[PDB]
Each structure stands twice: as C-alpha cells, then as structure tokens.
Amino acid sequence: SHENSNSATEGSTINYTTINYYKDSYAATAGKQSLKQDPDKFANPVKDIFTEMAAPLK
C-alpha cells in the first residue's frame, strides 16, 4: 500500500504480516512476529565462553 511509516516497530530486525485500511501504519493489526530467539543474551553473557564437556572453572 502507500501509507506513512507510523508503526512502533518500523526498523525492527523482525518482520510482520499485518492488515490495514488506513494511511497510518500504527492502525494495523498486530499480525505475526518472526520466531527468532537469543537466550544467551540473558543466560550465558560470559566474555570467554566455556563448552559443555569442560570444567567451567579451569
């Protein structure tokens, strides 16, 4: 379509498939989000990574 880029997610590393009937994109449906995850950001934010087989503190 030919609307404005009003949505709160314009420039998000994940892309959506939404529906809209208005010139402003924030009026659009929530749609579908891509299913990417990065748990290491929270669960394993160590500088020097350690493998599963080794002893963590060597």
Partner: protein, 242 residues
C-alpha cells in the same frame, strides 16, 4: 449500495480479536527508536535463565524470609539420610513459585519440556561430600530410603573445585503437554519428585564449620515451550490501587 448481510458476532467486542482501528492522530510520526541493550523477543528466552528455587519454603516470619533461599547439609552420623524433597511440577504451588520460570508458567495453561536444577554448594573449600539427587517419574511414591530413590533418574554429586552440579528433570510424560498439576484429578499431570540424599557424608577437618548451605537454581531446557495463554492465578491488589 453493495448487498451485504450481517452475521452473528456482529457488534461484539472480543478482547483477543486482532483487528484494525481508526488512527487518532493522522500523519503522526513516533520518536525514533535508538539502540537499547537487552531486548527480549520471546518469553522462552527468560525461561532458560536460572533463578533461585526455594526448596526451603518453610519459614514465614518476615525476618527469616531470606532463609528460604538456601537449605542445609551437615555432618551426618551414618548412612543414606534424606536431606530434602520437593515436587518437580513447575506450575504448582510450592518451591517453584519463587522462580521466574514458575511465574511465567502461570500465564500459560499447558507446558512441555525438560527442566534443570543446578545446585551450588557454598560451604568452605575444606568441606567434601557426595550427594545423590534423584528424580522420581509419575507413579513412584516419595522414596522411603536412598535404595528406592536410586532406582529412578539420578546424579551422584561430588563436592570439589566445580562448586555446582546439574540435575536434569527430563520430559517423561504420557501426553505431549501437561496442564498445571494440583491436588485432585489434575494430579494426572504431575511431573514427579526430586529427593536429595547423602551418598557418603559431609566431611570437614578441625576448624571448618559443621553446617553449610546449598543454593538451588532452576530453569527450563531448550525443548521447553508453553501454550494457551491465560491469566495468572494471583491478582496482586486487595482494594483499589490509589
């Protein structure tokens, strides 16, 4: 006009309906989004982060609440003594309510996947010991002794330079998903039990404390997913919030 005909559902307001609504501010543009560290994309990212499991969920007086975060071990005078026990059900009242996993679990009716509990020993460097941590799948009653606990899934933990050990509670279920287990017919969905025994003994030399504590950290494995979004059992307000 173009011929149309209204169907049931007309005028209803379904709170989960994903529709389109008239925008109040035409041509409005939001403040750009700068880079902010720590963006989360899926709740499952948080379920994999270990938080403290309150195995010792017994003291309730406000001045002793911190004691819930750790449980003890000490020199036993003998053999195969029981140290602690708890249900492995993540969305059931009890120890898991202290974990973020437990809490996020509250917003979903069903779950599936393996769990893991990592136990960190915090005694002195001079203290040694071996513990047997067992997971008893559904149907097995609370083990009366170490000899019956040892028949289920288990890890024998040796204290040492690596302070911690992980007990994986593998997904062993009859159904693909479990709903939250509770007393009654929904006990059909129970995960089972975890029990900790002394494999040998907590041993220490002259000069080191006779009692030490273990801190448990729990989370889900990568095969863990949840479904059927629902409201949590708790509503944290009494009257109106002012």
């Amino acid at each position: 006009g173009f011929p149309t005909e209204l169907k049931p559902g007309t005028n209803q307001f379904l709170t989960t309906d994903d529709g389109v609504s008239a925008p109040i501010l035409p041509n409005f543009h939001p403040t750009p989004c700068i880079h902010i560290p720590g963006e989360v994309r899926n709740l499952l990212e948080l379920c994999q982060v270990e938080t403290i499991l309150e195995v010792n969920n017994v003291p309730t007086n406000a001045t002793s609440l911190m004691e819930r975060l750790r449980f003890p071990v000490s020199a036993q005078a003998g053999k195969g003594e029981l140290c602690a026990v708890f249900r492995a059900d993540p969305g059931r009242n009890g120890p898991w309510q202290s974990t973020l996993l437990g809490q996020l679990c509250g917003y979903y009716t069903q779950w599936s996947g393996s769990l893991e509990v990592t136990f960190m020993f915090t005694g002195s460097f001079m203290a040694t010991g071996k513990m047997l941590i067992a997971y008893t799948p559904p149907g097995g009653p609370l083990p009366k002794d170490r000899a019956t606990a040892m028949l289920g899934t288990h890890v024998i933990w040796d204290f040492g330079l690596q302070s911690s050990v992980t007990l994986v509670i593998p997904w062993i279920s009859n159904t693909h998903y479990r709903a939250h287990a509770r007393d009654g017919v929904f006990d059909y969905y129970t995960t089972g039990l975890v029990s900790i025994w002394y494999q040998t003994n907590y041993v220490v030399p002259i000069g080191a404390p006779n009692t030490a504590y273990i801190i448990a950290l729990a989370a889900a494995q990568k095969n863990f997913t949840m479904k059927l979004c629902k409201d949590a059992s708790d509503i944290l307000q009494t009257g109106t919030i002012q």
